[PDB]
Amino acid sequence: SFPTRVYLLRHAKAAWRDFDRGLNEAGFAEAEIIADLAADRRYRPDLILSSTAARCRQTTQAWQRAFNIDIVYIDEMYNARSETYLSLIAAQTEVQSVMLVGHNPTMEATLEAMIGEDLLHAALPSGFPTSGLAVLDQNRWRLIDFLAP
């Protein structure tokens, strides 16, 4: 039964062709703060799957920094056809821990798919924030920690 740990990371705060928008200053700072919190709890993933969108790319570069991981870029994580990223997750049949780096609503929908709307609500009254990191473990997925700024 693999992955045994799922990390779900929303990209940091972007500034205002959408694909090419960057992380702004506060966006830059948060993703560092949160990346740092992570390797602190030792929340190191074997594989990172990220949007190719610059704002996801730069978000991911923060993590390489905190910890310097396998990383792959997938254009189809930007403006996804799917309501979730669940297939990216389960597909990785022999990788112990995996982290996805993409966007709302897909990111929020993925957590919802795994822990349900009621728990989603209790954990996040105002939804899935930028550079928010859900840490999930295994019949069913359990949320085990969440990082927000």
Rounded to whole angstroms, how far apart are CA atoms 123 and 69?
Answer: 28
Task: Say if strands 142-147 and 133-137 run parallel, antiparallel, or are unpaired.
Answer: antiparallel
| Integer angstrom CA distances of residue 77 from 26, 48, 63, 72 | 24, 12, 18, 11
Q: How many CB atoms lie within 10 A of CB 137?
A: 13
Q: CATH number for the domain including 7?
A: 3.40.50.1240
Tokens 């019949």 sit on residue = 139
Specify the number of domains making up the chain: 1
Sheet holding 97-102, edge to edge: 70-73, 47-50, 97-102, 5-10, 133-137, 142-147
Q: Bridge partners of 147? A: 133
Experiment used for this model: X-ray
Q: What is the resolution of this structure in A?
A: 2.3
Q: How many CB atoms lie within 10 A of CB 138?
A: 13
Q: Bridge partners of 102? A: 10
Q: How many CB atoms lie within 10 A of CB 19?
A: 13
Domain extent at residue 23? 1-149
Residue 91, helix vs strand vs coil: coil
Tokens 């396998």 sit on residue = 70
